RNA sequence: CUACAGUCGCGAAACGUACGUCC
RNA sequence: GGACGUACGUUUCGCGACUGUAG
């Protein structure tokens, strides 16, 4: 309602009519500065002329919040404020929206899809474009796919009235730079890819910015691992048992990978397990019914190796008990799934040592010391001041509910209430609101910028716990990259505007030529009909002549013999994307395959099995060799479109 | 050294001292270490910043004095040995104390939330008459300025407990002369 | 906690007095405690307000990460900021900002040479204590010597502020290529001048306490002789003489193209001979552009087969005949599928006519490798005396390592062993316990030395004499005065700096002449030196549309020459930031100059000179 | 030599001599040198440090005594004759032999680490009864104690054997008269 | 100056898994 | 189903530089 001085020191280069990279660290500051520029842009036109400012928003809550702000402010002047989402772009024409409105707040994938389609044939129909959180305009992102269509209009020499392309950020980003001049190269490349010339920052009003900045202090706390890892020993014995059982049906197992010595409980072991499991899907033994048992047994053994390898990591990060609970839940799932002579053997192998594992998990002396001082630093500052709200950033989804369980049952931590947001003292989240003056990064490495509300700063703490000093040194140099970002901004602000718009033209033209030389056409579609097998049973699913393409992205199978090879199951989270509605989630109709093949969807009137090539194996019937193509665009074949007149 | 000498100064003990504190070789200067150090694990480690003394009870002669200046937030009082080590100083059933809260306020805890003014002692001493459970927190020289009285249930010895804010490395307290 | 012993106090005692020293502590992870003692004393001794900054130059990434873990576990409890920089960490965080916020830095030394080259670190005065690891490798051009070049060039001349105290941590100062105590004294004084050091302190008082720790073993020399009934060498020598007669029939100048006159089968002399005639055969300018191709292709095939025969003889002289047989057979199969020629069909037919004879004679247990079976005898005698010992057997060449593992699998008597390549009984590792057997490598522990040539035992006795000479030389120098020693090393350093600053102008001339690039084997035109582009001064490629029709592609794609039977791999398809241009290797070319008539050879892209035009997408 | 003699001393064969031994023409006196002696390599040459004898077998009359002084590591015993020449003595399931290990204990094999006491036997004499099943090894003067027990599978040739780690040059084993 | 093993540094590329977003 | 981004880990390739051994 009433502007301030730093919100007008930022909006002043934008009102002159030149493109800007306004970088304000206030959450409500960006909304009010965009409001001021959007207000001044419309009221400068002569009679009959209209402004058609479009404000992009990348996320859904940001889109709806900016729609609620931009409509409840621009109602008294009679400006038509609408917004499009993916939940609104269906059954509503896009072209009659843009001609009938002024302050459209669409999300950018709609505009990229319509620019591919043909409606809104040029970006000259707007007169201003605002990019919210503009530092994602880097490579193949939907801001950059719009700026491609803008720059191929400006640099082509066929230009019309191009709009102002201002952009609102909070941190311009340094990326992969080391010294100051590489940071200057990166910020100049960003300003060239976003086509601006001036970078505005609060300079005269640093008092009005320091009172609302949300600047906490850091308290790095390196903590060690445990010394008597009995659990790692027992699961290591079980993994050696499963590995030795896996070699009796594949004697050449150690030839299937180019990795060095593999240790249990790292990510390298999961890389080795994934490589082995992909290498064991392409066997072509001439029995063709024992192969349906050999590849199934290999898939089962590698799945159990992967589950033990995940339980090791969950035990080394979280409490010890959640590893055994995760393993028991997976074994309950496989008990409810089915049973053969392999799975009965593996379950009765785990039951032999379940009691030893359950007794060694319940020791009062074998906590993680990382958790042991997490409870200490949670019981210090709460005891100092019992009105302190905290938030606990955890890396994985599997550890965001381990620690939810952990405070549920702690005698020292009875005064917390877990507030998982993947009457709440703590909020155990994975990825993020400027009300909590304690942030604890539980082994979590652009910094987590909590500058969001129309509030204050008032002092917070940013404790960082870890077990390896790489986590510490990454933040120790993140602070210095933030130290050189401000200096690169300040050095770039002292150039001349006649030479800067020429300096970015070099980068724009050079990148246009680099982008245009990589417009190589499609490879030759190999004509011959191949067929697809499952990745667990290797039974015949279909041939590649029954494959139809829905919208040049999705794939279905049209045959009638495919109708008896899958069994449906209702989807756990049904939603609607772009023409669709997730109905079911199909599985293989063998005795004990039950492999995740795809999704059963409702497209216009029909129910069709949208499949994915990621869980299949493509086989040529001419030679007999099998291959694994892991994305649909890499499996090159004769792509026939979908036709509703057939069925 | 001002009124009559009624007790000898305490000493922090190395078996029930919590795992984050680093009392020195004279065993009367308590400080917070940089990084927490490996100690023994049994039923005596408090897993907080709470430490006890080895001064047994008497009939009525107890008065002790420690230097509490240049500690960020502290809490001083008396507690019984028959107490769970996971508990907090001043929030148990029977352990009376006086807290220097985060709001720069000197409050007190007794089993409730009684509070003094905005005073902050550089030097405060606790008077004790162990036969009847009386306390007087005479700070420094100001006509025996106590400002709080507590009833103590003398059914156990009275090893006095001290808690400090443990997130500041280098933060310290020192036992001084009475 | 671990315990400080007394000799590890005596070793660190002189360096803590403020002298730049060279400890000569023996192995056994002892020096990694002496270094900890000196760091703990050096960081303590600075008064309040100022600070010290230790820098520990490692040399290999295992040793670097090992010492980083040790310094982390030892110094983090006391309140210091230990860190580590390497090549393993990516291009991040300018090094003058890591070293402004830490106190114990573990560099590998090429990082400091790099940061002193471009001036992102100002000078060596930022540190206060430099600790070398294995300081006896400070030598002609090693990176420790580049760091000490900067150190001495800062010391002498343009006098700067305070310089760091220098400490070296060798285990054997290594007096090699000396003869007597005089040359050992001059070499050790030269090294201690190259570190700017003054004390070569080692333990003297409780030397018997060191003797409680280190066990110098007693040796076992094994002079064993060669075979006699060399039907394998007879057939192979007949084949080699046959191929030499064919090459002499074609060339008729082969005996004067080389300069190694007396040629013996199965040694490095014949290898130098065949390499020199290979380098001499390609360089022929003649007015017959088909006959140069024919002659050079025939000579390439003949000389490559001769070189493979000579290396097969050398391999078979040190290992089983089966190993050389599978080597020869997979070589012949890999060249038979490479390209068909009547020369190649001739040579493969001539070998496979004798192949069954070689398999019949070779797979005979009466014709056993004597050195190998004496090794087996020693293995069984020691393992039956003690079934708990381990062997870390050192071999010269990796092919012999894998062949010896193939033998220890193909020995039924040695079922009780597990080989290892570099939970285990025997390790077979080349040029990195209780038995340190050296298969011809020039508490209850013995070391053997098996040889087929008498005179490497003479080299071992010369080595023992050198070791006694080294101990006598350091014991002679250690009783000197200090000031005459510091004057002596000052004049040695001034003389070496004076030699350093008079000849260092190796500035070449970029040539403007256009040239052509021929194939090394078939001698066909590939491209011109006016056509190649060099991308980021490290990725020499050919931008040329005529070049695109003169290779055949077959990791990624590896290209080959497009001739009818050439099969010569020039380079490799690589992907750039966007493009997929192929890079080439000059080791598979012959440079010819289009002005003159020379056909000069080169070995690497830095030596071959031209005007280097950078690559551009336009 | 105090009771009646039954048999005579064995003699060694030159057909299965060790490759590093120098047994002379008296054929009861072995001697080791440094360099291994070049012989013909066949399936009868032992190529290890085991030494056999040349006596033909009988029912129950067997006696001989060997001087086991001046030797560091030795192992003397009587076992089966028909075995592979690539195998060594003591690993077979039928071998009555004593393996005096370098770890200072008088061990022996029955295939099974059958370790015995800690004697240092001066003069070992192998007394064999294949007919009567009584094995006796009277070392030195100690009331004729056998100090080792064997059960035998008397259905095979039972040639007497020797085995000694000869890498100390000048080591010798000699048979004297009883 | 030829082969042989051992090492470091600088740039370019691909892959796996996890997390978040959007259609 | 698909597309994008981020983090961690692994592999590949090219170009240099250095030391030692034997000829
Ligand atoms: Zn299936
Ligand atoms: Zn060629």
Residue numbers in the entry:
A (entry chain A): 241 to 662, 690 to 699, 706 to 718, 722 to 923
B (entry chain B), D (entry chain D): 252 to 362, 364 to 430
C (entry chain C): 240 to 661, 690 to 699, 709 to 718, 734 to 845, 858 to 921
Reproduce text from the manuscript describing this model.
RIG-I is an essential innate immune receptor that responds to infection by RNA viruses. The RIG-I signaling cascade is mediated by a series of post-translational modifications, the most important of which is ubiquitination of the RIG-I Caspase Recruitment Domains (CARDs) by E3 ligase Riplet. Riplet is a homodimer composed of an N-terminal RING domain (catalytic domain), CC domain (coiled-coil domain, homodimerization), and C-terminal PrySpry domain (RIG-I recognition domain). Each structure contains two RIG-I molecules, one p3dsRNA24, and one Riplet homodimer, but they differ in the relative positions of two PrySpry domains, which depend on the relative positions of their partner RIG-I molecules.
In the structure composed of the smallest population of particles (6.5%), the second RIG-I is not bound at the opposite terminus at all, but instead binds to a proximal internal duplex site. This results in a head-to-tail arrangement between bound Riplet molecules. Like other internally-bound structures of RIG-I, the CTD is tilted and its conserved diphosphate recognition pocket has melted to accommodate the RNA backbone. This is an interesting result because it suggests that Riplet forms stabilized complexes in cases where two RIG-I molecules are bound on the same RNA, even if there is only one triphosphate end (such as a blunt dsRNA replication intermediate > 20 bp in size). Importantly, we observe that the relative position between the RIG-I molecules is not very important due to flexibility of the Riplet linkers. As the second RIG-I in each structure recognizes different types of RNA sites, the two PrySpry domains bind to RIG-I from different approach angles, revealing variable distances between them, ranging from 58 Å to 101 Å. This finding suggests that the CC domains in these complexes are more dynamic than expected (consistent with our inability to visualize them), enabling the complex to accommodate different spacings between sites of PrySpry domains, and enabling PrySpry domains to approach RIG-I Hel2 from different angles. Despite the different relative orientations of PrySpry in the three structures, the PrySpry domain uses the same interface with RIG-I Hel2 in each case.
